Every structure is written in C-alpha cells, then in structure tokens.
C-alpha cells in the first residue's frame, strides 16, 4: 500500500 497516502504527485 501507499502506507496511508491518499494521493501521490
């Protein structure tokens, strides 16, 4: 998972 990040960039 993104480890709790909703969006990346």
């Amino acid at each position, epitope marked *: *998972n*993104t*480890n*709790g*990040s*909703w*969006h*990346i*960039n």
Partner: antibody, heavy 127, light 108 residues
C-alpha cells in the same frame, strides 16, 4: 477489532456550522488514510473528504470544497469534519471510513476502497 | 464528470445467481470495489480490487471486471441478500466515484 465511533452532527440552521468527529481504535491509525462519505436520504453514496495518514494532505469533493475541512490527530486517533456554511444539499447520513490506497509505480492507476465504516450520523440542515 | 452506471433495480429468484453490472468508459484499468448496504445499516465491503473477497464475507459473493463492465454476482440468492449494492472506483476528474446503486429484489 476495528472500531470507528462518530459524534457531533444532528440539526443545524442553513449558513451555520456543525463539526463531526470520528474516534478510532483496534488498528494502526498512523498507516491509514481516513475518510468521510455521505448519503442523502433515499439517495446514493458520495465521497466527501480524505486525510492522508502522516503528511497532513487533505482532499475534497467539488461539492464541499471551501466549506468543509477534514483534519486529524494521530496522537489521539481522531478524525474531524468541520462543516461550515451548511446547505439543504448537505442533509445526509455521514459515515467515517477507513480507506485502503494501493501501490502504483506512477499515478493514473488507483485502487481506493473503504474496508471499515462507522454506524453513520444524520446531519439535517433546516430552519 | 466521470460517471459509474448501475441498473436502478435487479430481481432474482431464491437459489438463482443475481448479476449487478457497473459501467464506465475505460473501466479495464480501474479497480472496482463493491459495497452491500442492507436497510438502516452502514455499507459493508463485499469485494475489493475487482475480485478479492474480505474475511467474513461468504464464498457465494464474488466480484469480476472484464472490459468496460464490472460485475457483482451472488451465488444462490437468499432472502437476507435483499440490499442496495454500490460499485466504486477512482478517476482523475472525480477522485473516489460511486455508482448510483442497485436495489436487489427477491422474487417470491
């Protein structure tokens, strides 16, 4: 055992404010994005807002941007939803939900799902 | 502006398989999750990432996504399966997007 207890909400006049809270336990709150999803009476599910786990970033549906503010306290395992300038269209059952966001090399590809939901709280906006 | 399309109602005889469709442009690369919402209750995750099943969900409920239509199928429908079912995905234009929902009616 994953638990999400919602408080606040209820009745409010249009133009006024209400603040929702979501208390969490039984999981690692530090590793999860936390969300608000609402449902207008007899209508469908609508995503409202999201808070990322540690970087302080916040996300909103176009319908609520500027009026609603999501915030969290990892040290207290609590999610808040400050709802300002309430409208009749905001009348709905509000759920707080734990979200799962997945591992993508670049963006454009996303798997976001709500695996645990609170019981839900009714927000009525009326004179 | 991106939309997910569900039939407003689906009817099925007990012991038969109900098929709930979810439609959207370029749905192939999107990950579809499904929610069961029984009357007066919170939505419950029944399918995640097109076809994965959570622990607690019966083997009868399984998901699928082929082409531009996502599919929820319930093997041997029972009376307790009457609920509203929602498909959900993600798009750059909407972030989290939900289908309008589908009410499952049991034919007796």
């Amino acid at each position: 055992e994953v638990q999400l207890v919602e408080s606040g909400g209820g009745l409010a006049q249009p133009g006024e404010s209400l603040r929702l809270s979501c208390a969490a336990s039984g999981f690692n709150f530090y590793t999860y994005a936390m969300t608000w999803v609402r449902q207008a009476p007899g209508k469908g599910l609508e995503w409202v807002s999201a808070s990322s786990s540690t970087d302080g970033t916040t996300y909103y549906a176009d319908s609520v941007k500027g009026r609603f503010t999501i915030s969290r306290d990892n040290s207290k395992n609590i999610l808040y939803l400050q709802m300002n300038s309430l409208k009749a269209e905001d009348t709905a059952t509000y759920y707080c939900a734990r979200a799962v966001v997945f591992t993508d090399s670049s963006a454009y590809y996303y798997s976001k799902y709500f695996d645990y939901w609170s019981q839900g709280t009714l927000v009525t906006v009326s004179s | 502006s991106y939309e997910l399309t569900q039939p407003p109602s689906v009817s099925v005889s007990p012991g038969q398989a109900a098929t709930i469709t979810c439609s959207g442009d370029k749905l192939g690369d999107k990950y579809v999750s499904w929610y069961q919402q029984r009357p007066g209750q919170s939505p419950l995750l029944v399918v995640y990432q097109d076809n994965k099943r959570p622990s607690g969900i019966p083997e009868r409920i399984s998901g699928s996504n082929s082409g531009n239509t996502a599919t929820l199928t319930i093997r041997g429908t029972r009376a307790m399966d009457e609920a509203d079912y929602y498909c959900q995905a993600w798009d750059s234009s909407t972030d989290v997007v939900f289908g309008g929902g589908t009410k499952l009616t049991v034919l007796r």
